[PDB]
Amino acid sequence: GAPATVTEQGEDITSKKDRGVLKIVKRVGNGEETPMIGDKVYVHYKGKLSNGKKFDSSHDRNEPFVFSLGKGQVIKAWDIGVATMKKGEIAHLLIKPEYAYGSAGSLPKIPSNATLFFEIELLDFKGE
Numbered sequence: 001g002a003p004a005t006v007t008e009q010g011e012d013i014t015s016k017k018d019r020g021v022l023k024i025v026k027r028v029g030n031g032e033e034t035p036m037i038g039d040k041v042y043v044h045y046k047g048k049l050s051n052g053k054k055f056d057s058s059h060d061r062n063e064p065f066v067f068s069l070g071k072g073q074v075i076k077a078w079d080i081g082v083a084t085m086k087k088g089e090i091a092h093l094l095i096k097p098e099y100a101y102g103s104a105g106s107l108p109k110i111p112s113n114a115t116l117f118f119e120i121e122l123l124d125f126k127g128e
């Protein structure tokens, strides 16, 4: 389904071109502007492990997930991926462990060497 389509059709948005972060835009945003490092970013997301054993959604909390882009608050893949998004964009990201929780993982919630998948909606972003 959605993850395999990203394997197949996803754009590699890493600087190193190591397929560590793959993206498909599923619903296109508006505006030419993408978030700059430092911005306060507001999203909705659904995420899961590739092993199928954990799911997590911002909607579970009945509120947007807010974070400051590039300011160390989220996994590298998010800092990379959300910088590419436009206001109102929905994107799919498939993420190798090097851009998520690495060999150590984040136990017990994230195992070692975990691949992760996200659907992300960029709701808004405002300047520091």
Ligand SMILES: COc1cc2cc(OC)c1OCCCCCOC(=O)[C@@H]1CCCCN1C(=O)[C@H]2C1CCCCC1
Binding pocket: 045, 047, 048, 049, 054, 055, 056, 065, 073, 074, 075, 078, 106, 109, 110, 116
């Ligand atoms: C809502 O709680 C979460 C959610 C994720 C991971 C977490 O800790 C590892 C976690 O507890 C700590 C708070 C979030 C820590 C950082 O999370 C992240 O960087 C990424 C991107 C922002 C949304 C959350 N997130 C996660 O890795 C989730 C994760 C939850 C398990 C299923 C796959 C996603």
